[PDB]
Every structure is written in structure tokens, then in C-alpha cells.
Amino acid sequence: GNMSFVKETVDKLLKGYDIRLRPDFGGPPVCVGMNIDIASIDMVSEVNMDYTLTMYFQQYWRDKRLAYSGIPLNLTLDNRVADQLWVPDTYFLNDKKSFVHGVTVKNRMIRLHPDGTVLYGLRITTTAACMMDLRRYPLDEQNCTLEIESYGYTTDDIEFYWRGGDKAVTGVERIELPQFSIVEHRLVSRNVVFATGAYPRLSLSFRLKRNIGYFILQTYMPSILITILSWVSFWINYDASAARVALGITTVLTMTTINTHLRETLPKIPYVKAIDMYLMGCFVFVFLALLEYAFVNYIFFSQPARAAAIDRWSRIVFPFTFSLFNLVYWLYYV
Amino acid sequence: GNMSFVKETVDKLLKGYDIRLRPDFGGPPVCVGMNIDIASIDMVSEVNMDYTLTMYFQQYWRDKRLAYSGIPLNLTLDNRVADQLWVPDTYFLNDKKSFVHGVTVKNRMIRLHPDGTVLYGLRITTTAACMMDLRRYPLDEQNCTLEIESYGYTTDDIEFYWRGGDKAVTGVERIELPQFSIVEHRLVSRNVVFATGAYPRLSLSFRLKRNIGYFILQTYMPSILITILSWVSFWINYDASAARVALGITTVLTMTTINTHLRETLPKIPYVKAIDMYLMGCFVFVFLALLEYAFVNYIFFSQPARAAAIDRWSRIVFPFTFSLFNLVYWLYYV
Amino acid sequence: GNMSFVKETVDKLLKGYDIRLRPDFGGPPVCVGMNIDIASIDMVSEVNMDYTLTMYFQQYWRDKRLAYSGIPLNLTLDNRVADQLWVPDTYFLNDKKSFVHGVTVKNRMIRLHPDGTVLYGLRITTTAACMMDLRRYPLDEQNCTLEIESYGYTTDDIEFYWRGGDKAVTGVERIELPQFSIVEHRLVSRNVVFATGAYPRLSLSFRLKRNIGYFILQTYMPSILITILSWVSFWINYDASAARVALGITTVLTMTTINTHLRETLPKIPYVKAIDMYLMGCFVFVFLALLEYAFVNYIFFSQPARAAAIDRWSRIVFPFTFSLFNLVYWLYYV
Amino acid sequence: GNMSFVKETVDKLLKGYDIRLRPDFGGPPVCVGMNIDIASIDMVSEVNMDYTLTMYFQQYWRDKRLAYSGIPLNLTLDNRVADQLWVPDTYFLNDKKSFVHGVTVKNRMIRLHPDGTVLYGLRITTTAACMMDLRRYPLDEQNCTLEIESYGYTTDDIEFYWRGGDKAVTGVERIELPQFSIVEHRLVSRNVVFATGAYPRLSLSFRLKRNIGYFILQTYMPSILITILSWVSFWINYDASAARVALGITTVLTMTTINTHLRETLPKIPYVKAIDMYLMGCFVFVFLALLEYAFVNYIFFSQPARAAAIDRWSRIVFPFTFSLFNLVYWLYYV
Amino acid sequence: GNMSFVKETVDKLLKGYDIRLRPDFGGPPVCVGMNIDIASIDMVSEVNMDYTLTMYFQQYWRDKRLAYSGIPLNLTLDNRVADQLWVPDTYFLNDKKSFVHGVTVKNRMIRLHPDGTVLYGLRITTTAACMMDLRRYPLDEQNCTLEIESYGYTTDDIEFYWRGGDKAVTGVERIELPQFSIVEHRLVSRNVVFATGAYPRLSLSFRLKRNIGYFILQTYMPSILITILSWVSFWINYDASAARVALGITTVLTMTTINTHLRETLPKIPYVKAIDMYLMGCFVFVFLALLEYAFVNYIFFSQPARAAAIDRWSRIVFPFTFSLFNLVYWLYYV
Numbered sequence A, B, C, D, E: 001g002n003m004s005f006v007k008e009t010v011d012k013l014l015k016g017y018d019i020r021l022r023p024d025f026g027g028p029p030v031c032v033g034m035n036i037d038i039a040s041i042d043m044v045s046e047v048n049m050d051y052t053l054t055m056y057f058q059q060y061w062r063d064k065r066l067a068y069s070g071i072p073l074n075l076t077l078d079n080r081v082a083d084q085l086w087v088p089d090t091y092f093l094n095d096k097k098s099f100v101h102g103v104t105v106k107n108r109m110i111r112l113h114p115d116g117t118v119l120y121g122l123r124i125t126t127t128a129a130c131m132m133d134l135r136r137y138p139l140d141e142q143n144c145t146l147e148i149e150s151y152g153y154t155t156d157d158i159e160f161y162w163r164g165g166d167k168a169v170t171g172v173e174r175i176e177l178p179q180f181s182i183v184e185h186r187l188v189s190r191n192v193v194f195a196t197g198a199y200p201r202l203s204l205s206f207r208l209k210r211n212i213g214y215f216i217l218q219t220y221m222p223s224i225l226i227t228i229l230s231w232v233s234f235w236i237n238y239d240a241s242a243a244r245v246a247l248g249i250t251t252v253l254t255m256t257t258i259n260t261h262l263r264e265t266l267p268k269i270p271y272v273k274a275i276d277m278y279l280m281g282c283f284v285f286v287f288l289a290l291l292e293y294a295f296v297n298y299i300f301f302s303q304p305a306r307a308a309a310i311d312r313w314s315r316i317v318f319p320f321t322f323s324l325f326n327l328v329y330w331l332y333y334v
Ligand SMILES: *[C@@H]1O[C@H](CO)[C@@H](O[C@@H]2O[C@H](CO)[C@@H](O[C@@H]3O[C@H](CO[C@H]4O[C@H](CO)[C@@H](O)[C@H](O)[C@@H]4O)[C@@H](O)[C@H](O[C@H]4O[C@H](CO)[C@@H](O)[C@H](O)[C@@H]4O)[C@@H]3O)[C@H](O)[C@H]2NC(C)=O)[C@H](O)[C@H]1NC(C)=O
Pocket: A143, A144, A145, A184, A185, A186, A188, A189, A190, A191, A203, A205, A206, A207
């Protein structure tokens, strides 16, 4: 009620405070409990092999130098006072670019409790690196992790734990990913040994399953239809050389344009993927159809009966071979 | 008139002022009234699912520690004095990259009133996230919101309201979006409960309706014309096998090129859209036209009468079926 | 020449100086005279609807607190002293991202005069928004403005004027825009009334006119040539059905590819422009040519004389109709 | 060797030092000698009309206030001391975005000398604007300059010179430009008069010559080959009307695709270029070949002798006219 | 255990500490031992000729002014204390844009030892320049280096060495590059003489070998198949002029589209590469095939026997010549 008394108490708390020394310096490690409230997952980039994530990151510890008595309330202080306290050197092991939002003020919260407990919250947009195995793309399932670690203090100076157990991370169910669906999320706590000692480590893992409907409608169906159109030339009479030659070579041209424009639209991932295998299979099928017609045209004059036999065998074989190829592809990648 | 007297008054106001404590700390919550003057909406991006917004954001509160007497004027102070006062920890819940303009100085205004009232203005360019339902794109109607919330203080320490009621937000009528048109805007005030307590929340919602003339001219009309050209082969005499094969396969090639280049130009939206369904329908129609010609050519030799009957039935059916498809499409999505 | 005396004078000037109070606080408004030296105009973006401008922006005013005697020279101080003086809160109304150059030092200049006059110069690069009416693109004329206003002070506290009258802006003649030409520039001074009062406003307007030679050589000539090639099929004998079908459908394919690649290369402007109308007109012309040939081929067998009459009428009509279309287009848009 | 004595000497030097006043304030101008060690030229952009340049920029002047005695050594101080010293307000006239590297510390060097001489080095990555005349692109020769000027001080307060004469700028020979070769570089020193007085100016000019092999292999040879393939139709007998029509129209289509995709790959420059003229010439040649074939096909029935004469004249003329066009092109632009 | 005693000791250490003077100023050079722990290599860019590298950079030196007694423990201090100590002016000679991570705090570590030893850790994401020889692309092998040098201090003031010998740099084996493979890494230490004297230099070099499977699947196989299709016209009977003309010209069109789209997808590298040579070889082969067919068609009427002889000679020559071309290409570059 008396603002002067509160100011006196806060000044007494910050008088003689040393920000260069951790709580219980030279004593037991200070336990820091962390919770994450995930606001959104902005994007998942395969080209950059990373993902953007916005979250409310809250740390909870206890500095007895900040214990105050006579005020039966929790002091929610201005965020600028965070520049005058000790805060954990928490960082994100696999991030590439992170920042704290600073509009209208720096998105930061300091709340002190009578027993010296400090709650310290930030709003962070971090671009965390996520190595992806795109061999089964676009039927792939990825696993992206956020790693949280102390930078300077070892496990003899600091310890990390998830505050609230498995309920430490919230907001996962509200994440809207246009292309993925979050199958599961896991929380792990452990210690990692490096040349400078043992460091606490927290891990938050998401498992994402890609949605395939867009690719099915826009990447496979045109190729299937072009392959069927390539088959069409089998029923065309072989006397009309121009018609069948034009049909085959134009199907080849359409397949090439489809492949090039899909490769332009699809992310630039320099190795073999499932969709690339399917496109190569379709291209090989149309190439074989054109080559078969060329052979039929060449051997037609010598023996037209054998030409007709080869034509009907192609009619009965090419759809069957393509059905087998599709069955193998959709059973190997599913 | 006496600048020395005014300097003395300001120094007296700022002497003993604790910026770490909110006004009336430990008492009733401080009421903050907010108004927004929207300068422009820079862009709306479906790829990033966001919109850029430049605005003048003004907050109004009362701090009795700043009440001054003897000066019958409102003191417009230099913006730098804002670093020596308590300001609310207002932030935008759904933004992604917000900044305050800083040329030639930080675009910030502090005005003090004799009764302790503070007016605090900022010029903010915020890129706010907006989830978009693009199932009906480009005939879609989006709803994009700006959420305003206190970061640290709860409803026991701060309260938000729209100063001026429904006239708090201005400049909406002057917004010039090249692709959208603001149908309506709304103001909402409420409280949101989180694990740390109840927080005030203001919401500014816009409803945007997309313009369709560009898409009609540049995306649908070419497809309709190519479909009509595909029908053209029905009136061509069947004996000219080369001409009909060339026409059908070249219509297919044009349709594929159109689809690929539109997909390249269209925003990267990894799910089915209405325009995609329409393009797939046109592609299926030209594919069926080519298949029908193939069937006619195959059965022409055995019984030309049946071939002619199929040709005339195709002439009478394909325009009819395409008209039905267009009617269904333009009644479902409108 | 005695640097100790000058240091004493400057320290006396800055001793007791209050940066939070404008000159003549509580008295007459302080007049600020502004001059702009435009170094360059970097770019004019149609997609983003803005232009980038680099300029030496200089503000001239009088602060009697800074008047000094005994030194018959103008004191060009280090720019850092600007952090210890009151400066106008000048900002740009329509800018989107401005910055002050800071290599090797902050590109800032402070000069003091014996009568208390302050000259304050900055080197600023600003991306100012400019809504463009691209209906007549690429034959359009744009009017892009830079607006200058006081953020916090009203006309009761500050007044703006163009120092030097019509010669307050220089370097316009030296601007090298590869695509536009600066027809004219104008200086406007006025006052703008908002809910918080009246504010001074300066406006510098440029009238840019686009150059059309590149569009003529790259965007219209290919379409005209493809239309002529479509006309070519008229003189081809109707017996060669395959030849005319291939010519017409391949002209259609070339027109589609040209349109798609031009749309990819042209700025993404989501509404109809003149060039789009021209491309659609050419597309309709080639479509009608193919339809006419189809009708001729259909009616050739029943009555070849009527088919030949239609063919020669097409030969005499299509160039004439295209000439009329071009005349209407080039007189409506010029 | 006695660090306390050196610290005392430095403190005495900085005691009473006024950074707001230049050396010899009110007296003769302070001469600043500059040298540049060019680390690399990162890129040269025609689209943005600029070039990125990383360099070690060193300034050399004398400040008698910093003269020290008793230490016969050059004091290489920590870079932060530069914040406590007067440094020239040197800036780059034509830069767009410059920064000083700051990892692991700000790349800045202060070296004091017994006679008061100060050496001040920075590592700067500057994006300098360069207007390019791309009429003769890609056979062009550009001249790109870096301008160095004093922002606030005139020639009465400061003077510039290249320290070391023509050897002031080093590292030019080690520059590896993938697309350009540095023919020459020049150093210029002068004075430029603006409305505020005369300012010293240094200029460093490079003359860049573009490599042509990539364009010859990738831009001209395909066009020449497509033109030759267009000529191929002349030797084809006119009885096969479909074959010649297909050949001509497909050569036209290939030319259109080549032009559009080259324009996509070529930098976005909105005016005429030499490569554009060459592509238009090739397009006109193939267009005229198709027109000639159409005329031959039209007049073939009435009088085959004249048709064959026109065909052989085309055979003997088209290569000759194309050779003349290439000779004119390669003599005018070289 | 006594925090007051530790605070007293630290304050005593920093009392009278001059950060402007290196350790042992005026005496022997201070030896700085460095170790790098590489976290990941983000990307390797052929367009920009640079690679992004994230690492933990640790420096080790001895400052006797920081030696403390009575505390038999190492002091891991808050990173902010790094602003109150001397640190080496280490920078990266070839970087273009580097930063130290700053979430949640600045990613920085200071550890002090009783004998005056300082360990200084940073987390740095640097984009280092790497000039690449893309003549043998995509069969190329690259050598990319990270250079480390002192900015202001010469070898008389500071010396660099790798702390740990060849084990100083760790994490190389765990680097995951999708496109490259790290063959070897080398650590070099030396001294480099500039005009201002000799500076210490450390170098960390990587040798990277590009993976070729993606290019074999998606860049070479389509060209080989298109060349084979161009051959297939040889077996087509030469009486069918339209079919062979269509096949040859459409193979040319597909080759052009493949080349243009690959050039668009491939990095912008404006000089000759191996893949460009292969594509030009395939283009020349299909062009020669079309020319040979044209010659056969021209000479067919005068003497069909010679035409058939040329046809069969082409059948036996073109595959052999292409096999020789492939053998030369794949033996020269491998
Ligand atoms: C994405 O991929 C990552 C790996 O790259 C997966 O992360 C792994 O997740 C599993 C759990 O699903 C982790 O396994 C667990 O590790 C715990 C920590 O081990 C450390 O600490 C213990 C002491 O507490 C030490 O003994 C140990 O040596 C380590 O130092 C263990 O405590 C867990 O054990 C518990 O469960 C097992 C059964 O699983 C029982 O047998 C045990 O008794 C005990 O109850 C467990 O082993 C694994 O460590 C994680 N790896 C990494 C590298 O972090 C993600 O799960 C994946 N994404 C998704 C969504 O799954």
C-alpha cells in the first residue's frame, strides 16, 4: 500500500547484490525449473533444414539474496530490473537465429516472491536447426528437437529440470501446421559431458508427419495421366507414322516439362527422394513406349503380323508393368 | 514561460520516482486506455500467413506520482524522458517482427497532464500472424486479428479498455489493399486466464474479401479457352489422324504448361484449393477428349457408323458436361 | 584558437541545459527550416509499392540557450554532442524502413552559430510507400511523395517551412532512374488536424513517367509476330489439315508460354493492367483464327466454294480487325 | 614495462580531453592521410547497380593533445579507447549499407605514437552504388568508384590525402572476380563545393571488364543453332507441307522458350541491351524463314517453277543475310 | 562458500584494472591458445562463394592482474564481466557476416583460475568466404578455410597457438553436409607480415568432396535419354518425312527446355562448367542428327540407295560417337 516502503525494500534487496555471482555461489547447485508455452510454429523449412518456433520461456529459481519480509505479496517488477539481477545463462543448443520481442517494451517478466524465489519469463522466436531425412519425401516423418543448456555453469553450479513434469510444455495441441501434423512431443532431462565438464540438458522433441494430399493431387496424378496418354498410342494404327511419333515425343516433352517445373517448385534438396524415383519411373515408361513404337515401325514392313502381335502385347504389358511399379512404390514407401 | 521553473517542476516529478513500480502499486489496478490510428496495411502474405501493419499506438493512464501544479499546460516532453517513466508492458500476442521507427528520432511521444495523466504514443510496424483458410482461394474471405495484452501484470495490476469505444481505432476506411477490401472491423475487450492468472486482452479484427477479377482474367479464361480448343477436334474429320492427335496432345501440353506456371506463380500453399480443383477439372476434360478421339480412331475401321455416332455424341456432350462442371463450381464456391 | 577557452564555453552552454524542453518552451513556437539534398533514388518497386531514397536532410532552428559570445566563428561540433541537445522530433509519415548511415561514424552533423542557431544534418535512406495506379501500366505516370511531420509537438510548439523557398530540395536533376523520368517535383507546406491537434507538414512530390521502349521491344513485338504467324495459316491450302492444325495450335502454345513467362517476369500486381488486356486480345485473336479454320474444315466437304470464300474473307478481315484493336488500344492508353 | 606508469600516462592524456573539438581547433586544418587494403570484392550486382567491398580502411592524423613522453614505444591500445578520442567524420558518399565487423570484438585499431600521431583502422564491408551502362551488355566495361568525404568538417577544418601516393590502396591485384577483370584502378584527391562550403574528397576508381565466354557458350550458340535449324527447312521438298510447317513453327517455339528463359536468367534491367537485340534479330530471321515458306506453299500450285526459284534463292540468301547481321553486330559492339 | 569474501576478492581484482592495456604490457607477448568446437555447418553456397559455420570458439590466456588467492576454486563468472576485462582482438580474416548468439543471454563464458588464467568462450555463427573452382562442377572438390588473426596487436604483443595440438578443433566428424563430405581438416599456425608488422595467424582448412548421385539421376540421365530418342529416328523409314522431322525438332525442343530449366535450377555460376559442356555435347549431337536426316531427305529423291547407306551409317556411327564422347567426358573429369 505504501509505495515508499516497497521502494525501500527493493533498494535493500538490490543493495550489495552481486550479479557476477550465482545464488549459493560455492555451494550446492541452484536448481532451475523451466516451462515452455508454445505460441506457434511459424514454418518448417527443408531447404534450410530448420524450423521457426515462438514460445514463452519461463525459468524458476531461488536466490536467497532477494528474500524479503513484511510484504505479503508477489512483486511483479518492471522488466528493466532484470538487468540488475543474476539470471541463468540458458541458451538453445541447436538454434541459428533467436531474439526476444521488444515491442512495445522488451517481452520480459520478473516476479519476485517472499521466499527469494524468482520467476523470469521471456518471449523468444528461435529458428532451431532440424536435420531431416528426406529419402521418403513427401511420405516422410521427421523428428525436430529443441535443446536447452547452460552455457558456462556446469552441473556443479546449476541444474535444470522440467517444472511440472510432462505438463511442463503447453500449447502443443494448438499448433497449426499447414503441411505437418504433430504426432507426439517428448520431454527429456539429462547431463552431457564435454571437455570443460558436465552440463545440464533439457530436450523438447516433436514428431511431425507430412500431409500427402497436396502432392497426390498435384505431383503424381499428372504423371499418371501422361503415362496413360503415352499408352494411348498403342491403339492408334501403325500406318499413321506421324500421329504416333508426334504423340510419343509430345508425351515425352510434357513429362520433361512436368519434371523440370516440379523440381523448380519442390525444395532444392540435393539427393534422391521418393518423388524423384516416381518421376524417373514415369519418364522411363514413356521412353520405353516410344522406343517400342519405333521398333514396331522398323519391323512392320518385314512382317506386319509380328508388328501387330508386338502392338497387342504392349497393350497388355505396359499397364500391367506400370501397375506393378506403382504397387512396389506404394508398398515400399508406406 | 519560465523554462527554469518548468525544469524544476519536472525534476521534482522525477526525483524519487521508482520506475520499477506501477502506479498505485499494491492498490487498485491502473486502467490503460488504448487507441490505434492505422497508417496502412503494407502487405498480406499467404505464403507466410501474416500481414504487415503500420500504426500509431497510443496508451493513456494516470500516474499520481507525476501530478504537477502551477503549470496550466500539458507538457509535451522529449521522447527520451520515456526511458525514465513507468510504461505498461503492452505487447502484441500474435506478432512476429515488430519495431518502432527511429528516424529522425525514435517515433515516440510523451505528454503529461496536470492531474497525473500520461499519454504515450508509438509508431509501430508489426508483422502479425494470421492463419488463413485457403480452401476457397481465390474466392476466400479471411479474418485477421491483432491481439494486445499485458505481459507481466495481471488483471489485479492493470486493466485495458478501448479509449473512445468503437471510435478507438481509426484509419480503417483509408486502407488501400490492392487485392483485398476491408468488409468490417471489430473491437473486443476481455480477460484471458493462464496458469499465472488473468490478463487483460484487446482484439482488433478485420474481415478481408479477396478481389477476383485478376484471377478470372489470368487464371480461368485461358483454361476455358484451351478446353474449347480441345473440343474443336470433335468437328475435325477422323480420317485426318495426324491433325486430331496433334491438336489433342498440344492442348494437353498447353494445359500442363499453364498448370505448372500458375503453380509457380501462385503462393506456396501445401493443400487443395478451389483454383487447383478447377485446373484439375479442365485437365481431366482435355484428357477425356483425347481418350475419346483414341477410341473413335480405334473403332473407326470396324464400323465407321458407330465412330461417327460417338463423334457427334461427343460434340453434344463435352460442352454440356463442362457447362455443368462450371455451374457446380460457381455455385459451390459462391 | 585557445581550445581550453572553447571547451569552457561549450561546457557552460551545456551546463544546466535541459534536453526535455524545446526552445522557447511555453512561448512562441520554434520555426524549423528544412532542406533536402537528394543523393539518389535507389529503386522504385511496383510489387512493394514503395521507393528507396537517400538524402542529406538538414534542419535549421534557433535555441537561445545555445547562444555564445566571444568566439567569432561557427562551431562545428562532433556529432556525439547531438545526443546532448534538443532536436526536433521530425519523422516521415509514409516511410516503412528508414535508417541513418553510421560508417565510419554516424552520418550526423551539428553546427552552432553565435546567435544560438543550430544546424543539424543527417544522411538518411528511407523506403517510402507510394501507392501506384497501375491500370495504365506500363504507360503510367506515378506521383510519389515524401511526407515530413512533427511526431509529438503541435503547431503551438513547432512550425515547419522549406528553407530557401522552392530551392529547398536539390539534386533532383542528378537522379538517374533507369526506368522512370522525373517530370516535375513540388514542395508543399501545410497543417494537418488530428484528434490531438494540428501538426506541421511538409511534402516533397515527384512525378515519374515510365519509359516504354523495353516493353515495346520485349512484350508487344513477340505478341504481334505470333499473331501474324497465326494469320499465316489462312494462305495455307485447306487440304493440308495437319499443317494448319499444327500451325494454329502451336501459335496458341507459343502465346500461352509468352503470357506465362511475361507474367512471371512482370511484377506481381494482383489486378488488371493494360499489358494484360493486350495479351488477352492477342490470345483471343489466335483463338478465333483457329476456330475459323475449324469451321472452314468442317464445311469444306459440303460446299468448298463457301469454304474458300470464308478463307479469303478471313485473310482480309483478321489483319483489319487486329489493326482496329491496336488503334483502339494505342489511342485509349496514350 | 611498468603497467601502472603507462596507465597513469594514458589517464593523463585522456584527462581533460574534449572529444567534441578537432585537433588544432580554431587553427590550421588537421590533415588526415588514408590507406585502403582491399580484402575482397564480394559481388557486383547489375540488378541493384552496386558492388560489395570489404576493406581495411586506415586513417592517420596528429592530435597534440595525445602527445606523451617517457615511453619510447607506440601504444597499441584497446579498441574501446576509440570511444574516448576524436576521430574524423569520414564517410562514403555513394554507399548504401556499410557496417564494421564486430566478431569477436569490433574490428577497430587505435595506435598512438609519441609525437601525438594517431593511427585508426577499421574493417568495413560497404555496399557502394555503381551506375552501369548496360547498352553493350554483356560486352560492357564498367567504372565503379568509392567516394570518401568528410561529413561535417569543411576544408578549413580537415584535409584529406592518400597516404603513400599511388601505393595508398593495396590488395587490388589479389581480387578474384568470377565475372569481371580489373583493368585499372585510380586514386583521385580534390575538393567539392556544396552550399555549406568546400569539402575534401578522395576517390578510388576501378575499371571492370566483363568476361564473355559464358555468354557465348550459353546464350548465343543455342540461338545460332536454332536459326540454322530454321534454315534446314529450305532443303526440304515443298510437297511435305506438314513437315515444313512443323519444323518452322517448332523453331519459332524453341526461339520463344530460349528468349523467355534467358530473360528470366538475365538480370532484370528495364531497357535495351545488345543481347536482346541479337535475340530479336534471330527471332526475326526464323520468322522470315517461316513467312518465306508460307509464300512458297501458296504460290506452289499456280507456278511450281517460281516456287522452286524462291526456295533456292532463300537457301542462298538466308545464311548470307544472317552472316551480314552477325558481322555488323560483332563489329559494332566490339 | 562465503559470497561476501568472493565479492571482495573480485572487486579487489577489478580495482585499478586497466582494460586498455594487454597483459604484460610492454613486456613479452601474451600467448593465446585457441580451440574450436564446431556445432554444425549450415550451408555451402556456390552462388555467394561462402559457407556458414556455427562453433564454440574458446581462447585461453594468462593475465596476472586477475590472479587471486585464498579461493581454491575456479570462478565461472557472469558473461557481463567480460566487458570489464582485456580480451584479445581476435577476428576472422575471411568472414563476411558474423555474430555472437544472444538468447537468452549473450552466449559468452568467462572462467578465471587462481594463477591468473582466463578462459573465454563464445558461440559464433560466421559466414566465411570460400573461393571455389567450379570448373569441374559437379565433380568438384573444394578447400574452404577459416582464418584467425589478431587485429591490432602484432607478434611482439600476442602469439596464437592451437591449444591441444591437432585435437584443438573437435566436432568435425559429426558435421552433416547433405551435399558434401568432409575428406580432411588441417590446422596451421604461422605469422603473416603486413606493412604494420607481423601478425599471428591460425588456419582451419576443410576439404570437401561433392556428392554426385543426385546430378547423375536428375541432370545426366534425361540428357542421355533424349539423345537416344534423337537416334531412334534413324530406324524410322525415311519416306515418312513428317514423322522424322517432328521427332528431330521435338527432341531439339526438349533439349532446349532441359538446358534452360537446369540452368535456372543450378547455381548462378557465370563461367564454363563440366555439366554445361555435357549439355552442349548432347545438344550438338541432336542437332547433328537432325542435320543428317535433312541431308538424307534432300539426297533421297536423286539416289535412294545413297540415302539408305547414309541412314545405316548414321545408325552405326551416332551411338559410337556418343559413347566415345561419354568415355572422354567421364575419364577427363574422374
Ligand atoms: C527424436 O530423437 C531423439 C533422439 O535423437 C529422441 O530423444 C530420446 O528420447 C528417449 C525417450 O523417448 C530418451 O531416452 C530416455 O533418456 C533418459 C535420460 O537418460 C540420461 O539420464 C539417465 C539417468 O536419468 C542416465 O542413466 C542415462 O545414461 C542418460 O544420461 C532416461 O532416463 C530414460 O530411461 C527411462 O526409460 C527407459 C525406457 O525408455 C527405462 O529403461 C529407464 O529405466 C527409464 O525409466 C530414457 O532412456 C533419449 O535419451 C533421447 N535421446 C536424446 C539424444 O535426447 C526423441 O524422443 C525423438 N522424438 C520423439 C518425438 O520421440
